[PDB]
Amino acid sequence: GKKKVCYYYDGDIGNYYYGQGHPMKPHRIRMTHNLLLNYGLYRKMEIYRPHKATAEEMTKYHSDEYIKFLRSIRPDNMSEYSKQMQRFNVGEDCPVFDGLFEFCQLSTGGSVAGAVKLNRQQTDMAVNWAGGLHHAKKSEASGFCYVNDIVLAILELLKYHQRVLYIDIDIHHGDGVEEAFYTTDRVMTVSFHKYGEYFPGTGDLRDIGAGKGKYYAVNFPMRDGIDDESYGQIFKPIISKVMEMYQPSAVVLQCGADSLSGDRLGCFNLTVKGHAKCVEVVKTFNLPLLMLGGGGYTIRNVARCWTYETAVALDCEIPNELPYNDYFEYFGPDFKLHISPSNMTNQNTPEYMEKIKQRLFENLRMLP
Numbered sequence: 001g002k003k004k005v006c007y008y009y010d011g012d013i014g015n016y017y018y019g020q021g022h023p024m025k026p027h028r029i030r031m032t033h034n035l036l037l038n039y040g041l042y043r044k045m046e047i048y049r050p051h052k053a054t055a056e057e058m059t060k061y062h063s064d065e066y067i068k069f070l071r072s073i074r075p076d077n078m079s080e081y082s083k084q085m086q087r088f089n090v091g092e093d094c095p096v097f098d099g100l101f102e103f104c105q106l107s108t109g110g111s112v113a114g115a116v117k118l119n120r121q122q123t124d125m126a127v128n129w130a131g132g133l134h135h136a137k138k139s140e141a142s143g144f145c146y147v148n149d150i151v152l153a154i155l156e157l158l159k160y161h162q163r164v165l166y167i168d169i170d171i172h173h174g175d176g177v178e179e180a181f182y183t184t185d186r187v188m189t190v191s192f193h194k195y196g197e198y199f200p201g202t203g204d205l206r207d208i209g210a211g212k213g214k215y216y217a218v219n220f221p222m223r224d225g226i227d228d229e230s231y232g233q234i235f236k237p238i239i240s241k242v243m244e245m246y247q248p249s250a251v252v253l254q255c256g257a258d259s260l261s262g263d264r265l266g267c268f269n270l271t272v273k274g275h276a277k278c279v280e281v282v283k284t285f286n287l288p289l290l291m292l293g294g295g296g297y298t299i300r301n302v303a304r305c306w307t308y309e310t311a312v313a314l315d316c317e318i319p320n321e322l323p324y325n326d327y328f329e330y331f332g333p334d335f336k337l338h339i340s341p342s343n344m345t346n347q348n349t350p351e352y353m354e355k356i357k358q359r360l361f362e363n364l365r366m367l368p
């Protein structure tokens with residue numbers, strides 16, 4: 001039936017600024033929070049302020065040198081770190097900004113605290129919209145991500161769970177998470193993403209893991225314009241087959257909203273209902289679930305998406321008419337929660353979708 005939901009948020013998160021022109025806007029986390037508060041979604045959730053994750057907690061995955069660099073670099077001392085900035089990929093995608101380390105600490109803190117709460121069996125679902133920064137590598141920042149909160153949260157879940165399933169619906173391939181667990185069978189990574197002339201360039205359907213991890217990495221490459229009907233047609237059957245064969249005891253779901261129609265960086269055509277259908281599908285398996293944020297660059301749509309997905313987690317129906325809120329003007333001209341898909345062509349033909357699904361099913365037959 002209905003589940004206990006714990007939600008992680010720090011009121012300072014929305015103040016971190018990547019810089020003029022950078023599409024990553026932490027303010028979208030504050031817009032999501034304000035919208036869900038105005039819908040009354042706080043009445044049924046336990047709301048927690050995450051602790052600032054320590055450099056030591058971060059080094060359970062990242063190298064000591066990389067975390068030391070992140071804790072030391074600032075816009076005023078950048079000139080003395082030109083060498084380390086190149087080595088750690090800090091530059092245009094991953095700039096140095098005021099409070100960078102504290103932003104990482106809050107993003108990570110929410111994910112790890114949620115994983116601890118799930119491990120203690122004190123909640124059925126834990127939500128951290130500030131997390132889901134899937135591109136960060138052991139000693140390298142990548143694609144707007146500096147610390148891989150997902151990998152750290154999964155390592156925490158692995159203390160009490162033999163098998164953990166990671167599912168990523170961000171439009172970009174979840175490369176940092178896949179790479180971290182590529183050679184183990186204790187984590188199965190499943191990523192649905194745009195593939196072909198698109199960042200990060202990885203996630204081919206032939207990338208299936210290595211060594212003990214062979215068959216434990218699953219990639220569903222897609223083309224521009226995927227819609228609710230097409231996405232829905234493959235998501236449930238793939239996730240159902242993965243649940244059946246892998247039998248995970250905990251799940252982490254990265255809910256990157258850049259797979260929505262009208263995204264500034266994405267080229268998919270999902271609606272908020274289509275995107276949220278993934279949360280409904282995963283929730284139906286009744287396993288401990290950590291829901292995380294990720295991409296999303298048309299910020300009014302990110303707020304709508306994550307507000308609706310929090311309502312889905314709580315099994316609460318919310319009206320389409322948006323309640324008045326601190327950012328009401330951002331939701332014009334309609335002031336509605338749900339969005340309409342565009343007229344963009346869906347390059348993913350029904351035959352292509354079935355063919356890729358059948359190839360993934362062949363790989364899933366190889367599990368013990």
Ligand SMILES: CCC(O)(O)CCCCC[C@@H]1NC(=O)[C@H]2CCN2CCCCCOc2ccccc2-c2cnc1[nH]2
Pocket residue numbers: 021022023092093132133134135143144145170172199256258265294295296
């Ligand atoms: C949070 C999780 C996530 O949503 O998955 C992160 C997605 C990360 C995408 C990284 C990718 N980066 C690139 O294509 C890099 C490699 C060559 N370019 C150069 C960097 C350009 C400047 C910074 O970037 C932008 C600035 C303005 C507008 C768009 C971009 C941009 C678009 N795509 C990129 N960057």
Ligand SMILES: [Ca+2]
Pocket residue numbers: 168169170171172173174191192193
């Ligand atoms: Ca993905």
Ligand SMILES: [Ca+2]
Pocket residue numbers: 181182183184185187188189209213216217
């Ligand atoms: Ca794996």
Ligand SMILES: [Zn+2]
Pocket residue numbers: 170171172256258294295296
């Ligand atoms: Zn993305």
